[PDB]
Design an enzyme around this catalytic site. Structure first.
Site, PDB file in Angstrom:
ATOM      1  N   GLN A   1       0.778  -1.238  -0.118  1.00 13.30           N
ATOM      2  CA  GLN A   1       0.017   0.066   0.011  1.00 13.30           C
ATOM      3  C   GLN A   1       0.963   1.229   0.055  1.00 13.30           C
ATOM      4  O   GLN A   1       1.977   1.232   0.668  1.00 13.30           O
ATOM      5  CB  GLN A   1      -0.902   0.223   1.057  1.00 13.30           C
ATOM      6  N   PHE A   2       0.321   2.451  -0.672  1.00 18.77           N
ATOM      7  CA  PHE A   2       1.136   3.419  -0.942  1.00 18.77           C
ATOM      8  C   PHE A   2       0.910   4.411   0.330  1.00 18.77           C
ATOM      9  O   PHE A   2      -0.295   4.781   0.743  1.00 18.77           O
ATOM     10  CB  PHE A   2       0.816   4.363  -2.128  1.00 18.77           C
TER      11      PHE A   2
ATOM     12  N   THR F   1      -2.811   4.213  -6.046  1.00 21.59           N
ATOM     13  CA  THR F   1      -1.943   3.501  -5.594  1.00 21.59           C
ATOM     14  C   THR F   1      -1.758   2.229  -6.321  1.00 21.59           C
ATOM     15  O   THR F   1      -2.506   1.640  -7.104  1.00 21.59           O
ATOM     16  CB  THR F   1      -2.638   2.625  -3.996  1.00 21.59           C
ATOM     17  N   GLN F   2      -0.091   1.833  -6.432  1.00 21.23           N
ATOM     18  CA  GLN F   2       0.254   0.779  -7.191  1.00 21.23           C
ATOM     19  C   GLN F   2       1.426   0.177  -6.341  1.00 21.23           C
ATOM     20  O   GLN F   2       1.990   0.538  -5.324  1.00 21.23           O
ATOM     21  CB  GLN F   2       0.569   0.941  -8.631  1.00 21.23           C
ATOM     22  N   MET F 107      -3.265  10.285  -4.497  1.00 22.03           N
ATOM     23  CA  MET F 107      -3.091   8.756  -4.197  1.00 22.03           C
ATOM     24  C   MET F 107      -2.757   7.905  -5.477  1.00 22.03           C
ATOM     25  O   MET F 107      -3.047   6.834  -5.415  1.00 22.03           O
ATOM     26  CB  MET F 107      -4.243   8.344  -3.568  1.00 22.03           C
TER      27      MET F 107
END
Ligand SMILES: *[B]([O])([O])[C]([C][C]([C])[C])[N]C(=O)[C]([C]C1=[C][C]=[C][C]=[C]1)[N]C(=O)C1=[C]N=[C][C]=N1
Ligand SMILES: [Mg+2]
Lengths: 222, 235, 240, 244, 212, 233, 195, 231, 204
Positions: A1-2, F1-2, F107
């Site tokens: 997860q970022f 997000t990746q 994000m």
């Protein structure tokens, strides 16, 4: 997860004098256990005799300062080159911060300058925009190390007069610019010793009726 | 037919020029600026004696330091006043200070040319915006439906405007007191009005640094009318 | 969407669509409003060209906006329903947020604001309706009577009339209504209102409607027989 | 641009009239006459089909009388296509009210809703108004039996007896003469047919040129029945009343 | 945080502490937890510093607009409901607010509304809000009467905050007093707890547990 | 997000008396698999700037296209495109820095760490860093990933502060960079022997060196190391 | 909030609702009226999540009062209950649903019959002789099953209601600070000031 | 005639009358002058008053530290266009850390005015602008017309009676271009140029409005007793 | 937590010789708490009968929805909807809420007015049609109902005999389910008469 947030360390300090004001900060920038830069300026002249620093996540810190500098520029355009007073700048910054209430600027903001009576002024903010005028404020990583020292040596807290034994307090005499710079330097030397994210260099911006001056001092590079 | 935002061969917007004609039909409003304050006065002009004249509201507060008088299609002014009040309060919220009189006027004038095929037509009302701030002191502005605003030492708008303006040309000087300015508005209003001037068909107001914007009582104006009559009879 | 500017200025500084909307009001049945010392009365004309009507179910001319405020009108009937609906909605909205019913001035200011908005909005024409709004503010015994018109201007009146032949009944009221001493009782106020309508109406049978509004949400509509007694007494005094 | 071609359907005349509404009313005056008569024990709806043919399938035909719900019905005068747009909207409103409050919609509330839709087309949108006039015949437990009418202006009014479409002036005079308050349905049936028989532009009034309907409490005990008359049933009531 | 407000003969007493914390770290001892909305309305602050400041400052702008439009002072009921309706729009988003809206009007009399970021809006005579609310309630409930002098009522409020400042770790710093009357509010000073505690102990004969 | 898939490792750089040097290896890794051996990760912009990129390679190629498009756009209606109004390193950096912080704020970040090296119009050395978080900083030496931990220490012995820049020649500076690349090959498990180096000098301009190799490696001492403690054979 | 009860007798509907408001560890108020008058002959009590309860109740109140003015007519208790159920049934599939349970007590002036409706936050409506929300029903339904008689007077209904409150005060852990009782009959709505 | 109802209609000779009518509004406006050397660029503007009680309408607007303009025609339209320039100057600084080129600023104004001349419903801008600035290629002076046409010049003038000042500059071309490192003398030449457009009225202390930008000189505006030196 | 078993309840339907039967319990609860014993789950639109189990708010919502739709159908079509057509209407209406479904278990029962042919059908919560010859079951005691119907049922039962079979199937299934019972109703349906019978059963 970022994870959109990070921690660039650092520490900042603002002190308001009788007819002057200072805003200091170390020049070290970090991630985790590495040094990014030994000299990365953190306190900025924003015009109208106002200095600013947004300590914590540098990406959010740079973004905010950039947007406030922008706000000053448009204040001049929209209101006939009127000088933006320190109290007005503070309220404006509250709205910039609260504008991102549900995705905050992860920073501790401090501004310094002179009020409209010419007396020294410092304002302090939390990440989501709450603010308050103060005589003294340290922010950032080593804020917990510095504030108690300032309660004692600037506001003479827990200090009384000899002979009276706790009855009469130590009077709150005013501090000169030379006396304040001594306290700032000692605060950062002490913080550098016990906080790993503080060091390399100290840059102080002094604000008087005459304008904005700068002073730089070396700090320990370990 | 033809466009609403169309230019005439002389280089003027048809609709803006036509709205100015509607303003000429409106009731008279006068403003005078002094070093001691700014005075605003209007002609109420009731269409019938059964109409309760105190309900006629042609002088209006925007903020504590800014007042406003109108002339023309007065219904159109309501949204302009609402915008002005919102702008004044919003600026105080953002900057913790009073808003400059010029900046308030500029905000109102930005609405003016937002019409096309936004609202369907220009405003049919002119405004006199009077106020005070620390930078430029006591100020009086004239805001038109063209989007243009001029500052004035003194100004009259409405049906008796050019007659009143010529009178203001001679009477105004830089050392006028507030009392002198009040009487001067009453004098000129009495001159251009159809019906005889009294406290029920004419309204005074002022803005000072100390007390702020105040609409005068009918009892207070009545005394200034009586004071005017005596000083004209004195020579 | 349809964006065409229907209300626009003309070379002589007139908005004809707003002015033609006033002509629709001139065509409408007469309506009158008179305020006494402790009451307000709203009189309305019913044109007797329409008989075989069902008076039980036919839309009445005076409409309650809230329990303490009423609204009568002159002009297009269909247009009036839209203003009445918006007003009724705003009345409940005010009670919901401010926790206090609307003042008669506030409700008028709202209705007048709607009317104004339709004079400088694209794709819409002005309302062909002028209204008389009357009532008593909450916890207040001072009577209130306001008028609105298509342009959006509004004002307070000691007494006022609108609609067809309103010029005549306004003439009557201007000489008969004294400000220093208004109609002290309900009887006197209703009598003056019926008198003013009798200058225009024709027959005093089912052509006159009367609605009395008193303080503290006390509103009642008079019946045919009750009004007929006023009609009888007025003419018997006139025979002299 | 496009302004050049705009008819401006929602404006006032110098006299303060709505051009398009007035012209739509002129259209409706050429439509087949429809009559509604309200009695103490029910309501009658009668209407005249326009110049028919022998090859028109009558028993499956419907141009005048339409069912809105079990309690309310309408008689149409004007453009049939325009009427059906509105009728389907009215049918939906009635079902929305029933779903919300779990009670059948009062007659006036349904009438006000359709009338408000018509009004909208006269004040905004730049579209032509609906060229339709309705006679609403319905029942609810507040006001009992009710007759209403609406026109393209969006204005509506209540009636004891009323006509729309062609020859309304002549028809209304005849109704005004013979109508009494203590009247019954069987009498009202006779009045409706006699009125059409005198106002009609046709040579003679026959079963194939009519649509007929009654709303009676003549249903087994406290309830209301709608009866849309069949061709043979219209033929019988014409013989009974002595018109053929 | 400890904040309280109560109705009595002489109007309303409002009293608050001054402490702000981030975890165990004392961030500020000089926080202004009473907002001067206008000369007649006060708002108390508890929970999120930013949420409370921002929206209660915003709140004064809405009221100023009300009296500009209506030519009349806004009611405490309408005042509190503007705030409660606003936070109800944000419900779920994570606002953190515990507030009293206190004031006085001709039509209402002295009035206090408890307003809450859950949407709760409650009129009442006595309220205590914050982490040290339970401590303040003890002193108030045992000593409250309608017939209190302005002098005695002010002290009870001061003493109730002191009680909570002592026991509650997340309350302290100093006490700000306000007195709300017919003619508006009146500020009654900043009282440092470091000096107030010893003064009260000596004069009142209380806190015999602590040594001095 | 990746998550980043095909990735590039350290980018290293420093200042010297008349300009700046930057370097990065030619590998595109797919986890532990050393998938692509011919990937250029230094991308020049004009004749005065070189942008070195680490992290996700698909995102690098996107950034490469943005820069290519930036040059095209600057030439539009610009008679001084090859002179006074040419793209400066400072302009190119600030653009990227804007994009990086915008993308993190939606994000949906560009999963990279970037170093923009170049020389300005007035001859001043430009060297600044930016990454997926939009964090920026400048320093006489800059490095990404493993380079930050291993290269910077070595490079800081040559230029420790600002006053050491005029005292550092191009020969001394290139020597330090090449040595750092050797050290990274010894110690980074996602590095390759092949690399590219770029010099931007205020006098001699932009020199771009391809197909360089790590040489003069010490391995001979390995033969003497036996077992993990007690073993002798 | 906590406890809300309802009982329909011969000629009226009686609603009882607790006075306490507890936020966390302290009881902020002990005199709270958890009810709103929707129309002269219709009363609605409510309980659920903080904020949502009042916001929902007043929203319904405003809508019914709007209907009353528009039609100059009072809706039947059955009609009002159906409107309320639909609003909650709409709400349950929203972004943030209303977390509110209600009892609707009304006197139908047409049928001359009292009516009690119980509706939960999902939009689940039932007409009942006696009802309750939350944990209240767990204690009270057994008593009502035994004593209730359809033809009870209003005084007999209040006595049976006292027996319910006494049981709650004995066996429930939470101190709900007593109840406010209101009666709905042909003459309208009134509050029993001593209970 | 029949082809001037809207901006979407060419005439039979290929003219756009609504654009030409907008051009007329500029000619009605008060005179303003612009000129430059190699080091500095100057704007001089004659302000106009409504009457003796009124103020003198402001003519010069600042866009950035290095750029600004003077207006002639509809003042609100100048406010809209100057606001757009302020934003574009600002976008260039924030995103690219780059002061916007004066030439590129002209290109952006041209494209903004054009869209208003090709679409139905809208209208052309009713104002003309003189933009001065100092960028990486030295001093610049631009002339904007609401047709969209933008032109870089050594000197120019727009407004009523502007032909007189334009001829003077055409004679003085060789002299004033050489005035390098001397701001006061360049303003003197601008004041003497605008004087060739005056009739009846003369340059008073609250009538005149001057602005300058240069090598080490931010865009500043002079009004009141600050221009008494040049009268 | 599980929406389909908060309130509880059951429905069963069967075919016979020239007749159909549909039956349901009367319980509505909040998990363990029994709230109402008068919550009927069978509705009818003309001669077509619909039984609905599951979340009670949806049971009520869908009833109101199918009343709405069948009323508009009748006005436009000028005839009552048939069981076969109505079945398709239920399937359509449920599937349009594919990814936000009504938590229900509908059951259709009726006799086609033209052909006279007996017809029954069942659905899952999202629209799938089960058109059985013999019987359909639904609710929290569906397992129990499957067992009862599979053993008790025989084809071509006379109306009065079919009543006994379906009644015993429901009653004994409900008595083995905690969330079903508290009363029961049975509809016997012939081509032009319908008898409704309330059953006496244990009230626990
Ligand atoms: B009080 O404790 O509620 C106090 C009131 C606030 C307006 C200053 N709140 C805080 O101190 C909160 C933390 C907290 C403690 C106990 C309960 C709830 C919340 N602190 C902050 O909001 C804050 C703001 N800026 C910096 C540090 N802390
Ligand atoms: Mg250190």
């Amino acid at each position: 997860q970022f994870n959109p947030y990070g921690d660039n360390g650092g520490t900042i300090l603002g002190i308001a004098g009788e007819d002057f004001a200072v805003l200091a900060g170390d020049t070290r920038n970090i991630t985790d256990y590495s040094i990014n830069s030994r000299y990365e300026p953190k306190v900025f002249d924003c015009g109208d005799n106002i200095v600013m620093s947004a300590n914590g996540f540098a990406a959010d810190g740079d973004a905010l300062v950039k947007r406030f500098k922008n706000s000053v520029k448009w204040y001049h355009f929209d209101h006939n080159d009127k000088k933006l007073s320190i109290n007005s700048a503070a309220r404006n910054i509250q709205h910039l911060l609260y504008g991102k209430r549900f995705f905050p600027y992860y920073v501790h903001t401090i501004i310094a300058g002179l009020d409209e009576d010419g007396k020294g002024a410092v304002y302090s903010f939390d990440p989501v925009g709450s603010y308050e005028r103060e005589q003294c404020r340290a922010g950032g990583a080593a804020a917990s190390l510095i504030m108690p020292f300032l309660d004692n040596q600037v506001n003479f807290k827990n200090q009384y007069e000899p002979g009276t034994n706790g009855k009469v307090k130590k009077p709150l005499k005013y501090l000169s610019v030379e006396e304040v710079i001594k306290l700032v330097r000692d605060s950062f030397t002490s913080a550098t010793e016990r906080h790993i994210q503080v060091g390399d260099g100290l840059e102080i911006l002094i604000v008087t009726k005459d304008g904005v001056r700068k002073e730089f001092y070396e700090l320990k590079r370990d | 037919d033809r466009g609403v935002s169309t230019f005439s061969p002389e280089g003027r917007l048809f609709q803006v020029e036509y709205s100015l004609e509607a303003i000429k039909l409106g009731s008279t409003a006068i403003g005078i600026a002094t070093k001691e304050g700014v005075v605003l006065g209007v002609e109420k002009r009731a269409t019938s004696p059964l109409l309760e004249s105190d309900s006629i509201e042609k002088i209006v507060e925007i903020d504590r330091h800014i007042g406003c008088a109108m002339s023309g299609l007065t219904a159109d002014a309501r949204s302009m006043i609402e915008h002005a009040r919102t702008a004044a309060v919003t600026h105080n919220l953002y900057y913790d200070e009073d808003i400059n009189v010029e900046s308030l006027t500029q905000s109102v004038c930005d609405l003016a040319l937002r019409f096309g095929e936004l609202m369907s037509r220009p405003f049919g009302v002119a405004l006199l915006i009077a106020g005070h701030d620390a930078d430029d002191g006591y100020q009086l502005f004239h805001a038109e439906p063209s989007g243009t605003f001029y500052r004035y030492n003194a100004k009259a708008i409405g049906s008796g405007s050019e007659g009143a303006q010529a009178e203001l040309l001679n009477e105004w000087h830089s050392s006028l007191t507030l009392k002198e300015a009040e009487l001067l508005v009453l004098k000129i209003l009495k001159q251009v009005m159809e019906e005889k001037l009294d406290e029920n068909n004419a309204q005074l107001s002022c803005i000072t640094k100390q007390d702020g914007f105040k609409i005068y009582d009918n009892e207070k104006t009545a005394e200034l009318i009586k004071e005017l009559k005596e000083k004209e009879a004195a020579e | 969407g349809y964006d065409r500017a229907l209300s626009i200025f003309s070379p002589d500084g007139h908005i004809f669509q707003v002015e033609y909307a006033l002509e629709a009001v001139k065509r409408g049945t007469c309506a009158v409003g008179v305020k006494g010392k402790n009451c307000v009365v709203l009189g309305c004309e019913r044109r007797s060209t329409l008989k075989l009507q069902d008076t039980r179910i036919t839309p009445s001319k005076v409409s309650k906006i809230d329990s303490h405020v009423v609204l009568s009108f002159s002009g297009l009937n269909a247009d009036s329903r839209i203003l009445i609906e918006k007003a009724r909605v705003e009345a409940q909205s005010h009670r919901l947020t401010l926790e206090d019913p609307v003042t008669v001035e506030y409700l008028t200011r709202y209705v007048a604001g709607v009317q104004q908005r339709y004079t400088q909005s694209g794709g819409v024409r002005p309302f062909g309706v002028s209204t008389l709004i009357a009532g008593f503010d909450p916890r207040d015994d001072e009577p209130k009577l306001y008028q609105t018109e298509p342009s959006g201007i509004y004002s307070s009146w000691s007494a006022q009339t609108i609609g067809r032949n309103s010029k005549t009944v306004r003439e009557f009221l201007e000489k008969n209504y004294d400000r220093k001493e208004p109609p002290a009782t309900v009887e006197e106020c209703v009598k003056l209102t019926v008198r003013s309508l009798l200058e225009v109406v024709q027959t005093g049978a089912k052509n006159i409607e009367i609605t009395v509004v008193k303080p503290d949400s006390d509103i009642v509509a008079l019946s045919s027989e009750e009004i007929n007694q006023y009609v009888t007494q007025i003419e018997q005094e006139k025979q002299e | 641009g496009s302004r050049r071609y705009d008819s401006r359907t929602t404006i006032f005349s110098p006299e303060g009239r709505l051009y398009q509404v007035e012209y739509a009313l002129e259209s409706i005056s050429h439509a087949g006459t429809a009559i509604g008569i309200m009695a103490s024990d029910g309501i009658v709806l009668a209407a005249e089909r326009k110049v028919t043919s022998t090859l028109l399938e009558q028993d499956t035909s419907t141009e005048k009388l339409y069912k809105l719900n079990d309690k309310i019905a309408v008689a149409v005068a004007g453009l049939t296509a325009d009427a059906e747009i509105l009728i389907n909207t009215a049918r939906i409103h009635a079902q929305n009210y029933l779903k919300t409050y779990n009670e059948d919609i009062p007659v006036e509330i349904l009438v006000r809703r359709l009338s408000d839709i018509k009004q909208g087309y006269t004040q905004h949108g730049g579209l032509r108004p609906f060229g339709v006039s309705f006679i609403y015949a319905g029942y609810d437990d507040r006001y009992g039996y009710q007759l209403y009418t609406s026109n393209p202006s969006g204005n509506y009014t209540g009636w004891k007896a009323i006509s729309v479409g062609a020859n309304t002036s002549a028809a209304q005079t005849l109704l005004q003469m013979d109508y009494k308050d203590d009247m019954k349905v069987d009498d009202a049936i006779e009045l409706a047919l006699k009125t059409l028989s005198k106002t009609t532009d046709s040579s003679a009034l026959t079963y194939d040129r009519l649509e007929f309907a009654t709303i009676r409490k003549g249903a087994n005990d406290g309830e209301v029945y709608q009866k849309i008359f069949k061709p043979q049933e219209i033929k019988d009531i014409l013989v009974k009343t002595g018109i053929t | 945080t400890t904040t309280l407000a109560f109705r009595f003969q002489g109007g309303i007493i409002v009293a608050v502490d001054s402490r702000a914390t981030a975890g165990n770290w004392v961030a500020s001892q000089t926080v202004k937890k009473v907002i001067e909305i206008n000369p007649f309305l006060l708002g108390t602050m508890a929970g999120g510093a930013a949420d409370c400041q921002f929206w209660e400052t915003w709140l004064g702008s809405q009221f100023r607009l009300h009296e500009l439009r209506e030519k009349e002072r806004i009611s405490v009921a309408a005042a509190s409901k503007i705030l409660s309706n606003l936070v109800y729009q944000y419900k779920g988003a994570g606002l953190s607010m515990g507030t009293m809206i206190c004031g006085y009007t001709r039509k209402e009399g002295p009035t206090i509304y408890y307003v809450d970021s859950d949407g709760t809006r409650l009129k009442g005579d006595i309220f205590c809000v914050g982490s040290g609310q339970t401590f303040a309630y003890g002193v108030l409930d045992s000593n409250y009467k309608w017939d209190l002098s302005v002098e005695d009522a002010l002290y009870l409020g001061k003493r109730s905050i002191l009680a909570a400042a002592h026991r509650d770790a997340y309350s302290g710093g100093s006490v700000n007093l306000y007195h709300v009357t017919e003619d508006g509010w009146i500020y009654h000073g900043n009282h440092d707890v470091g000096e107030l505690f010893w003064k009260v102990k000596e004069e009142e004969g209380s806190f015999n547990n602590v040594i001095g | 997000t990746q998550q980043p898939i095909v990735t590039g490792t350290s980018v290293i750089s420093m200042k010297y008396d008349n300009g700046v040097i930057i370097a990065a290896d030619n590998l595109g890794s797919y986890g532990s698999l050393l998938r692509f051996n011919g990937v250029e990760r230094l991308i020049p912009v004009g004749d005065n700037t070189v942008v070195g990129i680490s992290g996700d390679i698909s995102d690098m190629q996107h950034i490469e296209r943005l820069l290519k498009d930036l040059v095209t756009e600057n030439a539009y209606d610009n008679p001084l495109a090859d002179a006074e109004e040419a793209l400066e390193p400072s302009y190119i950096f600030e653009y990227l820095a804007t994009v990086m912080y915008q993308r993190r704020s939606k994000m949906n970040p560009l999963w990279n760490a970037i170093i923009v090296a170049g020389v300005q119009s007035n001859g001043d050395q430009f060297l600044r860093y930016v990454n997926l978080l939009g964090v920026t900083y400048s320093s006489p030496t800059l490095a990404t990933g493993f380079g930050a931990h291993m290269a910077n220490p070595l490079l800081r012995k040559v230029v420790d502060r600002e006053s050491d820049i005029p005292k550092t020649t191009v020969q001394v500076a290139e020597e330090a960079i090449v040595n750092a690349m050797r050290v990274l090959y010894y110690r980074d498990a996602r590095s390759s022997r092949n690399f590219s180096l770029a010099i931007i000098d205020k006098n001699t301009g932009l020199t771009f060196k391809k197909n360089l190799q790590v040489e003069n490696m010490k391995w001979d001492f390995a033969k003497d190391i036996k077992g993990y403690g007690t073993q002798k054979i | 909030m906590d406890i809300i009860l309802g009982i329909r007798v011969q000629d009226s509907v009686i609603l009882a609702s607790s006075k306490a408001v507890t936020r966390g560890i302290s009881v902020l108020k002990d005199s709270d009226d958890k009810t709103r008058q929707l129309s002269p002959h219709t009363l609605m009590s409510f309980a659920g999540e903080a904020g949502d309860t009042v916001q929902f109740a007043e929203y319904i109140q405003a809508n019914i009062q709007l209907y009353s003015i528009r039609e100059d007519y009072e809706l039947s208790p059955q009609a009002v209950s159906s409107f309320v159920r639909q609003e909650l049934a709409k709400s349950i599939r929203s972004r943030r649903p209303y977390q509110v349970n209600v009892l609707i007590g009304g006197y139908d002036k047409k049928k001359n019959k009292p009516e009690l409706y119980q509706i939960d936050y999902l939009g689940t409506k039932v007409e009942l002789p006696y009802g309750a929300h939350g944990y209240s029903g767990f204690y009270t339904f057994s008593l009502l099953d035994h004593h209730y008689r359809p033809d009870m007077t209003t005084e007999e209904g209040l006595d049976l209601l006292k027996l319910c409150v006494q049981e709650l005060e004995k066996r429930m852990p939470m101190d709900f600070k007593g109840v406010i009782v209101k009666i709905v009959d042909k003459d309208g709505i009134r509050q029993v000031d001593d209970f | 005639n029949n082809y001037d109802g809207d901006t979407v209609t060419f005439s039979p000779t290929g003219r756009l009358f609504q654009v030409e009518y907008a051009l007329e509004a500029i000619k009605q406006g008060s005179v303003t002058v612009g000129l430059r050397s190699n080091t500095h660029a100057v704007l001089v503007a004659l302000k106009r008053n409504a009457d003796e009680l009124s103020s003198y309408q402001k003519k010069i607007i600042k866009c950035d530290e290095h750029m600004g303009l003077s207006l002639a025609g509809l003042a609100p339209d100048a406010r809209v266009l100057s606001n757009y320039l302020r934003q574009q100057c600002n976008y260039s600084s924030l995103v690219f850390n780059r002061k916007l080129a004066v030439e590129r600023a002209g290109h952006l104004l041209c494209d903004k005015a054009q869209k208003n001349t090709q679409s139905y419903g809208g209208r052309p801008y009713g104002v003309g602008l003189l933009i001065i600035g100092y960028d990486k290629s030295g001093a610049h002076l631009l002339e904007f017309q609401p047709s969209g046409n933008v032109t870089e010049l050594y000197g120019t003038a727009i407004g009523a009676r502007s032909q007189g000042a334009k001829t003077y500059l055409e004679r003085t071309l060789d002299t004033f271009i050489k005035i390098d490192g001397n701001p006061d003398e360049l303003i003197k030449a601008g004041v003497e140029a605008i004087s060739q457009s005056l009739r009846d009225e003369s340059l008073t202390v609250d009538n005149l409005s001057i602005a300058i930008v240069g090598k080490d000189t931010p865009f500043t505006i002079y009004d009141g007793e600050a221009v008494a030196k040049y009268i | 937590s599980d929406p389909s078993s908060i309130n509880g309840g059951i429905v069963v339907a069967m075919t016979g010789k020239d007749c159909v039967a549909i039956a349901c319990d009367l319980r509505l609860g909040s998990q363990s708490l029994g709230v109402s014993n008068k919550f009927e789950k069978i509705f009818h639109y003309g001669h077509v009968f619909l039984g609905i189990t599951g979340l009670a708010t949806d049971v009520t919502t869908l009833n109101e929805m199918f009343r709405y739709k069948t009323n508009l159908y009748k006005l436009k079509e000028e005839r009552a909807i048939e069981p076969e057509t109505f079945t398709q209407l239920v399937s359509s209406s449920l599937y349009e809420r594919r990814f936000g479904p009504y938590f229900v278990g509908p059951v259709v029962a009726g006799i086609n007015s033209k052909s006279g042919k007996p017809f029954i059908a069942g659905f899952d919560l999202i629209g799938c049609i089960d058109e059985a010859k013999d019987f359909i079951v639904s609710g929290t005691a569906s397992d129990q109902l499957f067992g009862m119907c599979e053993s008790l049922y025989e084809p071509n039962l006379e109306p009065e005999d079919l009543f006994e079979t379906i009644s015993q199937a429901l009653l004994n299934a409900a008595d083995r389910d905690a969330l079903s019972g508290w009363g029961a109703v049975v509809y016997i349906i012939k081509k032009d008469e319908v008898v409704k019978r309330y059953l006496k059963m244990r009230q626990d």
